[PDB]
PDB file of C-alpha atoms (C1' of nucleotides) in Angstrom:
ATOM      1  CA  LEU A 493      40.038 -32.497  26.079  1.00  0.00           C
ATOM      2  CA  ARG A 494      36.870 -31.776  28.015  1.00  0.00           C
ATOM      3  CA  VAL A 495      37.057 -28.549  30.033  1.00  0.00           C
ATOM      4  CA  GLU A 496      34.593 -27.054  32.610  1.00  0.00           C
ATOM      5  CA  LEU A 497      32.736 -23.686  32.069  1.00  0.00           C
ATOM      6  CA  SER A 498      33.504 -20.390  33.602  1.00  0.00           C
ATOM      7  CA  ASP A 499      30.901 -18.504  35.643  1.00  0.00           C
ATOM      8  CA  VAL A 500      30.039 -16.133  32.955  1.00  0.00           C
ATOM      9  CA  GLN A 501      29.605 -19.092  30.510  1.00  0.00           C
ATOM     10  CA  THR A 502      27.458 -20.889  33.026  1.00  0.00           C
ATOM     11  CA  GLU A 503      25.150 -18.038  33.591  1.00  0.00           C
ATOM     12  CA  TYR A 504      24.902 -17.379  29.924  1.00  0.00           C
ATOM     13  CA  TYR A 505      24.005 -20.994  29.274  1.00  0.00           C
ATOM     14  CA  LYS A 506      21.462 -20.968  31.994  1.00  0.00           C
ATOM     15  CA  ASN A 507      19.910 -17.607  30.632  1.00  0.00           C
ATOM     16  CA  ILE A 508      19.719 -19.083  27.112  1.00  0.00           C
ATOM     17  CA  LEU A 509      18.528 -22.520  27.993  1.00  0.00           C
ATOM     18  CA  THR A 510      15.693 -21.247  30.291  1.00  0.00           C
ATOM     19  CA  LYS A 511      15.006 -18.338  28.146  1.00  0.00           C
ATOM     20  CA  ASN A 512      15.526 -15.019  30.059  1.00  0.00           C
ATOM     21  CA  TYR A 513      15.010 -12.084  27.599  1.00  0.00           C
ATOM     22  CA  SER A 514      14.767  -9.663  30.482  1.00  0.00           C
ATOM     23  CA  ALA A 515      18.061 -11.028  32.053  1.00  0.00           C
ATOM     24  CA  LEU A 516      19.812 -11.290  28.692  1.00  0.00           C
ATOM     25  CA  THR A 517      18.753  -7.677  27.638  1.00  0.00           C
ATOM     26  CA  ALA A 518      20.041  -6.347  31.006  1.00  0.00           C
ATOM     27  CA  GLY A 519      23.402  -4.879  30.539  1.00  0.00           C
ATOM     28  CA  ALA A 520      24.191  -1.858  28.190  1.00  0.00           C
ATOM     29  CA  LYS A 521      20.613  -1.693  27.054  1.00  0.00           C
ATOM     30  CA  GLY A 522      20.664  -5.037  25.250  1.00  0.00           C
ATOM     31  CA  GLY A 523      20.718  -4.699  21.458  1.00  0.00           C
ATOM     32  CA  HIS A 524      17.870  -7.114  20.569  1.00  0.00           C
ATOM     33  CA  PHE A 525      19.340 -10.393  21.601  1.00  0.00           C
ATOM     34  CA  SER A 526      17.967 -12.910  19.087  1.00  0.00           C
ATOM     35  CA  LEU A 527      17.034 -16.194  20.543  1.00  0.00           C
ATOM     36  CA  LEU A 528      16.110 -17.899  17.307  1.00  0.00           C
ATOM     37  CA  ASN A 529      18.496 -20.865  16.566  1.00  0.00           C
ATOM     38  CA  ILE A 530      18.901 -21.656  20.322  1.00  0.00           C
ATOM     39  CA  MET A 531      21.619 -24.264  19.655  1.00  0.00           C
ATOM     40  CA  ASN A 532      23.587 -21.666  17.835  1.00  0.00           C
ATOM     41  CA  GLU A 533      23.526 -19.352  20.939  1.00  0.00           C
ATOM     42  CA  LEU A 534      24.423 -22.354  22.984  1.00  0.00           C
ATOM     43  CA  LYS A 535      27.434 -23.235  20.845  1.00  0.00           C
ATOM     44  CA  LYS A 536      28.394 -19.420  21.147  1.00  0.00           C
ATOM     45  CA  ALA A 537      28.105 -19.514  24.901  1.00  0.00           C
ATOM     46  CA  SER A 538      30.207 -22.747  25.054  1.00  0.00           C
ATOM     47  CA  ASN A 539      32.832 -21.040  22.970  1.00  0.00           C
ATOM     48  CA  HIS A 540      33.205 -17.562  24.533  1.00  0.00           C
ATOM     49  CA  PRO A 541      30.911 -15.019  26.299  1.00  0.00           C
TER      50      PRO A 541
ATOM     51  C1'  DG V   1     -33.961  73.144  54.610  1.00  0.00           C
ATOM     52  C1'  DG V   2     -34.301  69.825  50.046  1.00  0.00           C
ATOM     53  C1'  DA V   3     -32.594  65.961  47.262  1.00  0.00           C
ATOM     54  C1'  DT V   4     -29.072  62.440  46.381  1.00  0.00           C
ATOM     55  C1'  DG V   5     -25.887  57.834  47.332  1.00  0.00           C
ATOM     56  C1'  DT V   6     -26.120  53.677  49.679  1.00  0.00           C
ATOM     57  C1'  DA V   7     -27.423  49.699  52.886  1.00  0.00           C
ATOM     58  C1'  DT V   8     -30.899  45.979  54.298  1.00  0.00           C
ATOM     59  C1'  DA V   9     -35.150  43.671  53.490  1.00  0.00           C
ATOM     60  C1'  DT V  10     -38.869  41.219  50.411  1.00  0.00           C
ATOM     61  C1'  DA V  11     -41.190  39.388  46.267  1.00  0.00           C
ATOM     62  C1'  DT V  12     -40.201  36.963  42.028  1.00  0.00           C
ATOM     63  C1'  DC V  13     -37.577  34.106  38.443  1.00  0.00           C
ATOM     64  C1'  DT V  14     -35.035  29.875  37.349  1.00  0.00           C
ATOM     65  C1'  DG V  15     -32.064  25.636  37.398  1.00  0.00           C
ATOM     66  C1'  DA V  16     -31.835  21.641  40.055  1.00  0.00           C
ATOM     67  C1'  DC V  17     -33.423  17.760  43.355  1.00  0.00           C
ATOM     68  C1'  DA V  18     -36.541  14.207  44.464  1.00  0.00           C
ATOM     69  C1'  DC V  19     -40.993  11.871  43.906  1.00  0.00           C
ATOM     70  C1'  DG V  20     -44.138   8.910  40.910  1.00  0.00           C
ATOM     71  C1'  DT V  21     -45.019   5.732  37.017  1.00  0.00           C
ATOM     72  C1'  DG V  22     -44.589   2.726  33.052  1.00  0.00           C
ATOM     73  C1'  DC V  23     -42.194  -0.647  30.543  1.00  0.00           C
ATOM     74  C1'  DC V  24     -39.137  -3.017  28.623  1.00  0.00           C
ATOM     75  C1'  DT V  25     -34.829  -4.561  28.589  1.00  0.00           C
ATOM     76  C1'  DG V  26     -31.226  -6.461  31.078  1.00  0.00           C
ATOM     77  C1'  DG V  27     -30.088  -9.848  34.756  1.00  0.00           C
ATOM     78  C1'  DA V  28     -30.725 -14.606  37.350  1.00  0.00           C
ATOM     79  C1'  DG V  29     -31.275 -19.423  36.942  1.00  0.00           C
ATOM     80  C1'  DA V  30     -31.188 -23.894  34.357  1.00  0.00           C
ATOM     81  C1'  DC V  31     -29.951 -26.846  30.166  1.00  0.00           C
ATOM     82  C1'  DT V  32     -27.477 -28.161  26.278  1.00  0.00           C
ATOM     83  C1'  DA V  33     -24.379 -28.571  22.241  1.00  0.00           C
ATOM     84  C1'  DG V  34     -20.433 -27.317  19.938  1.00  0.00           C
ATOM     85  C1'  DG V  35     -16.299 -24.185  19.467  1.00  0.00           C
ATOM     86  C1'  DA V  36     -12.071 -24.289  20.734  1.00  0.00           C
ATOM     87  C1'  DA V  37      -8.242 -26.043  23.623  1.00  0.00           C
ATOM     88  C1'  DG V  38      -5.131 -29.739  23.821  1.00  0.00           C
ATOM     89  C1'  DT V  39      -2.424 -34.010  21.679  1.00  0.00           C
ATOM     90  C1'  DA V  40       0.087 -36.790  18.332  1.00  0.00           C
ATOM     91  C1'  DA V  41       1.988 -37.344  13.575  1.00  0.00           C
ATOM     92  C1'  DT V  42       4.112 -35.769   9.127  1.00  0.00           C
ATOM     93  C1'  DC V  43       6.301 -32.694   6.152  1.00  0.00           C
ATOM     94  C1'  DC V  44       8.099 -28.294   4.478  1.00  0.00           C
ATOM     95  C1'  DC V  45       9.811 -23.561   5.318  1.00  0.00           C
ATOM     96  C1'  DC V  46      12.746 -20.370   8.063  1.00  0.00           C
ATOM     97  C1'  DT V  47      17.033 -19.280  11.132  1.00  0.00           C
ATOM     98  C1'  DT V  48      22.224 -18.570  11.927  1.00  0.00           C
ATOM     99  C1'  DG V  49      26.655 -18.976  10.808  1.00  0.00           C
ATOM    100  C1'  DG V  50      29.576 -20.049   7.463  1.00  0.00           C
ATOM    101  C1'  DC V  51      32.187 -20.898   2.045  1.00  0.00           C
ATOM    102  C1'  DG V  52      32.918 -20.179  -3.206  1.00  0.00           C
ATOM    103  C1'  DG V  53      32.547 -17.779  -7.671  1.00  0.00           C
ATOM    104  C1'  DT V  54      30.362 -14.122 -11.076  1.00  0.00           C
ATOM    105  C1'  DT V  55      29.429  -9.973 -12.047  1.00  0.00           C
ATOM    106  C1'  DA V  56      26.945  -5.971 -12.394  1.00  0.00           C
ATOM    107  C1'  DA V  57      25.801  -2.505  -9.264  1.00  0.00           C
ATOM    108  C1'  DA V  58      27.735   0.808  -5.982  1.00  0.00           C
ATOM    109  C1'  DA V  59      31.132   4.134  -4.775  1.00  0.00           C
ATOM    110  C1'  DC V  60      34.578   7.728  -5.625  1.00  0.00           C
ATOM    111  C1'  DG V  61      36.628  11.543  -8.111  1.00  0.00           C
ATOM    112  C1'  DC V  62      36.590  15.235 -11.487  1.00  0.00           C
ATOM    113  C1'  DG V  63      35.173  18.636 -14.984  1.00  0.00           C
ATOM    114  C1'  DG V  64      31.541  21.542 -16.599  1.00  0.00           C
ATOM    115  C1'  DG V  65      27.426  23.607 -17.647  1.00  0.00           C
ATOM    116  C1'  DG V  66      22.492  23.828 -16.527  1.00  0.00           C
ATOM    117  C1'  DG V  67      19.473  25.369 -13.276  1.00  0.00           C
ATOM    118  C1'  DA V  68      18.265  27.562  -8.743  1.00  0.00           C
ATOM    119  C1'  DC V  69      18.169  31.786  -6.615  1.00  0.00           C
ATOM    120  C1'  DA V  70      18.626  36.643  -5.867  1.00  0.00           C
ATOM    121  C1'  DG V  71      17.925  41.343  -7.545  1.00  0.00           C
ATOM    122  C1'  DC V  72      15.385  44.879 -10.168  1.00  0.00           C
ATOM    123  C1'  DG V  73      11.790  46.929 -12.905  1.00  0.00           C
ATOM    124  C1'  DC V  74       7.017  47.368 -14.327  1.00  0.00           C
ATOM    125  C1'  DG V  75       2.485  47.091 -15.017  1.00  0.00           C
ATOM    126  C1'  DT V  76      -1.645  45.232 -13.818  1.00  0.00           C
ATOM    127  C1'  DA V  77      -4.904  43.344 -11.036  1.00  0.00           C
ATOM    128  C1'  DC V  78      -6.536  42.861  -6.538  1.00  0.00           C
ATOM    129  C1'  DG V  79      -7.391  45.296  -2.007  1.00  0.00           C
ATOM    130  C1'  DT V  80      -9.960  48.979   0.094  1.00  0.00           C
ATOM    131  C1'  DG V  81     -13.448  52.183   0.959  1.00  0.00           C
ATOM    132  C1'  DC V  82     -17.975  54.341  -0.019  1.00  0.00           C
ATOM    133  C1'  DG V  83     -22.736  54.725  -1.914  1.00  0.00           C
ATOM    134  C1'  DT V  84     -26.570  52.069  -3.657  1.00  0.00           C
ATOM    135  C1'  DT V  85     -29.365  48.131  -4.482  1.00  0.00           C
ATOM    136  C1'  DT V  86     -31.147  43.843  -3.395  1.00  0.00           C
ATOM    137  C1'  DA V  87     -32.185  39.837  -1.463  1.00  0.00           C
ATOM    138  C1'  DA V  88     -31.648  37.127   2.785  1.00  0.00           C
ATOM    139  C1'  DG V  89     -33.893  36.507   7.116  1.00  0.00           C
ATOM    140  C1'  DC V  90     -38.019  36.543   9.852  1.00  0.00           C
ATOM    141  C1'  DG V  91     -42.940  36.081  10.492  1.00  0.00           C
ATOM    142  C1'  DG V  92     -47.217  34.482   8.053  1.00  0.00           C
ATOM    143  C1'  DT V  93     -51.149  32.097   4.893  1.00  0.00           C
ATOM    144  C1'  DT V  94     -53.372  27.627   3.263  1.00  0.00           C
ATOM    145  C1'  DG V  95     -54.287  23.648   1.966  1.00  0.00           C
ATOM    146  C1'  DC V  96     -52.489  18.745   0.814  1.00  0.00           C
ATOM    147  C1'  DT V  97     -49.263  15.075   1.096  1.00  0.00           C
ATOM    148  C1'  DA V  98     -45.186  12.351   2.776  1.00  0.00           C
ATOM    149  C1'  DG V  99     -43.576   9.950   6.508  1.00  0.00           C
ATOM    150  C1'  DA V 100     -42.779   8.342  11.464  1.00  0.00           C
ATOM    151  C1'  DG V 101     -45.058   5.705  14.789  1.00  0.00           C
ATOM    152  C1'  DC V 102     -48.417   2.236  16.316  1.00  0.00           C
ATOM    153  C1'  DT V 103     -51.464  -1.923  15.681  1.00  0.00           C
ATOM    154  C1'  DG V 104     -53.064  -5.870  13.173  1.00  0.00           C
ATOM    155  C1'  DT V 105     -53.271  -9.926   9.774  1.00  0.00           C
ATOM    156  C1'  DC V 106     -51.386 -13.022   6.845  1.00  0.00           C
ATOM    157  C1'  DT V 107     -48.621 -15.166   3.439  1.00  0.00           C
ATOM    158  C1'  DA V 108     -44.678 -16.275   0.727  1.00  0.00           C
ATOM    159  C1'  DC V 109     -39.919 -16.870   1.477  1.00  0.00           C
ATOM    160  C1'  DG V 110     -35.921 -18.475   3.590  1.00  0.00           C
ATOM    161  C1'  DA V 111     -33.775 -21.408   7.461  1.00  0.00           C
ATOM    162  C1'  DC V 112     -33.073 -26.176   8.399  1.00  0.00           C
ATOM    163  C1'  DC V 113     -32.441 -31.166   7.765  1.00  0.00           C
ATOM    164  C1'  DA V 114     -31.771 -35.625   5.131  1.00  0.00           C
ATOM    165  C1'  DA V 115     -30.428 -38.048   0.864  1.00  0.00           C
ATOM    166  C1'  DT V 116     -28.179 -37.632  -3.549  1.00  0.00           C
ATOM    167  C1'  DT V 117     -25.117 -36.720  -6.941  1.00  0.00           C
ATOM    168  C1'  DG V 118     -22.388 -34.060 -10.002  1.00  0.00           C
ATOM    169  C1'  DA V 119     -19.003 -30.325 -10.345  1.00  0.00           C
ATOM    170  C1'  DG V 120     -14.215 -29.452  -8.622  1.00  0.00           C
ATOM    171  C1'  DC V 121      -9.291 -31.119  -7.789  1.00  0.00           C
ATOM    172  C1'  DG V 122      -5.576 -34.338  -8.795  1.00  0.00           C
ATOM    173  C1'  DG V 123      -3.089 -37.882 -11.801  1.00  0.00           C
ATOM    174  C1'  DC V 124      -2.660 -40.709 -16.286  1.00  0.00           C
ATOM    175  C1'  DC V 125      -2.673 -41.243 -21.440  1.00  0.00           C
ATOM    176  C1'  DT V 126      -2.693 -39.285 -25.677  1.00  0.00           C
ATOM    177  C1'  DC V 127      -1.945 -35.501 -29.594  1.00  0.00           C
ATOM    178  C1'  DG V 128       0.188 -30.927 -31.762  1.00  0.00           C
ATOM    179  C1'  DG V 129       4.167 -29.179 -32.329  1.00  0.00           C
ATOM    180  C1'  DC V 130       9.194 -28.813 -31.899  1.00  0.00           C
ATOM    181  C1'  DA V 131      13.396 -31.146 -32.376  1.00  0.00           C
ATOM    182  C1'  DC V 132      17.190 -35.119 -33.389  1.00  0.00           C
ATOM    183  C1'  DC V 133      18.996 -38.549 -36.883  1.00  0.00           C
ATOM    184  C1'  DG V 134      19.497 -40.903 -41.519  1.00  0.00           C
ATOM    185  C1'  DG V 135      19.242 -40.661 -46.683  1.00  0.00           C
ATOM    186  C1'  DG V 136      19.031 -38.387 -51.501  1.00  0.00           C
ATOM    187  C1'  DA V 137      19.999 -34.170 -54.702  1.00  0.00           C
ATOM    188  C1'  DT V 138      23.066 -30.099 -55.984  1.00  0.00           C
ATOM    189  C1'  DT V 139      27.463 -27.319 -56.296  1.00  0.00           C
ATOM    190  C1'  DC V 140      32.574 -26.190 -55.287  1.00  0.00           C
ATOM    191  C1'  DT V 141      37.860 -27.192 -55.168  1.00  0.00           C
ATOM    192  C1'  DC V 142      41.522 -29.770 -57.253  1.00  0.00           C
ATOM    193  C1'  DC V 143      45.232 -33.026 -59.783  1.00  0.00           C
ATOM    194  C1'  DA V 144      46.791 -34.376 -64.022  1.00  0.00           C
ATOM    195  C1'  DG V 145      47.743 -34.288 -69.578  1.00  0.00           C
ATOM    196  C1'  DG V 146      48.689 -31.670 -73.781  1.00  0.00           C
ATOM    197  C1'  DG V 147      51.166 -27.882 -76.029  1.00  0.00           C
ATOM    198  C1'  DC V 148      54.930 -24.303 -76.350  1.00  0.00           C
ATOM    199  C1'  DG V 149      59.514 -22.010 -75.311  1.00  0.00           C
ATOM    200  C1'  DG V 150      64.698 -22.163 -74.044  1.00  0.00           C
ATOM    201  C1'  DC V 151      69.750 -23.974 -74.230  1.00  0.00           C
TER     202       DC V 151
END
DNA sequence: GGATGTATATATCTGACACGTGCCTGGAGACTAGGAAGTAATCCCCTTGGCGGTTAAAACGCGGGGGACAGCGCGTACGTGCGTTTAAGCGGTTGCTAGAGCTGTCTACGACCAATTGAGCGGCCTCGGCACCGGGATTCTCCAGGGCGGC
């Protein structure tokens, strides 16, 4: 069963895939968003925001 | 009526601005070579999120006593003040020598380049020593026969 993505999932996928440290850090002062293992973060974004 | 306090004017001292000059060091223009940026390939280490099992370290609680801290006494050693001494600080002599600066000459020593080759790095074969397996020598436990006692 292939399901489409929500808007939050789509913007998280676009922020990770086109790396946006400033945009990913924005919101409750970040917390040192680690973009090492890009595919791990993409799988996390595909699962749940 | 005489001398004192105060205001304005003039000469002199002093830091700062501009003018002048040398010179030498930085800037402009041109040329060239190589340092570094970029590209592709290969291979190994690091990242993130998990699982499993061992186990020794970490955590928690509790009793107790050793040590930190406060207080007090005391005596000594350091602060304080004064009078006396002494040596630092300044100015000075008198010559000679060391050293910075500048100029000049020259020569041995180090940069540079080409050819060479032999010392450093990797793998391969062998020995020294440690270990695995087979055989000989030495000592320990055991089963059976002979003799004696009882009904």
